[PDB]
Amino acid sequence: NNLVETTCKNTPNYQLCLKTLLSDKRSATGDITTLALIMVDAIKAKANQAAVTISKLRHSNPPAAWKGPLKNCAFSYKVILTASLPEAIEALTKGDPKFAEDGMVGSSGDAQECEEYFKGSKSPFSALNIAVHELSDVGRAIVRNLL
């Protein structure tokens, strides 16, 4: 909480980091690694929401021009959920935190890539992509403490 405030101050979004960490009881007696793991779980929650939203859209007679965007978004979130985040959790838990930094850089970039497919047009789950990107950037910053 002092630790939580100090940690969050050294991220790109203080209040998002605060709200996210304090929502999890593990933060009260956390150390920095615990805080990074809480952050990874927050990213995972949003990424799963994104994946399900993509599936719904793909199965709901979407605009023809969203075919590629949604297919590539589906791939982007599959990378996040099956590779990037599991890698971060394992590395933080029992490995080299550099790989967790890799995973957050990956998720940050993958959410951004997904949003940019809709450039020029309405992005149907913009706020989710933005959340995954922003939370991943907060996670990168938290993990940097461990390097």
Domain boundaries of the chain, sorted by first residue: 1-147
CA neighbor of 112 nearest in space, from 41, 50, 35:
50
Sorted by sequence, the CB contacts under 8 Å of residue 55 that are 6+ apart come out as: 74
> What is the rounded CA–CA span in Å between residue 144 and residue 83?
20
> What is the rounded CA–CA span in Å between residue 138 and residue 102?
13
CATH no. for 1-147: 1.20.140.40
**Is 56 labeled as ligand-binding?**
no
Alpha helices in 31-144 (DSSP H): 32-58, 67-79, 85-94, 97-116, 126-144
Render 63-86 in DSSP notation, one character per residue: -GGGHHHHHHHHHHHHHIIIIIHH
**Is 19 labeled as ligand-binding?**
no
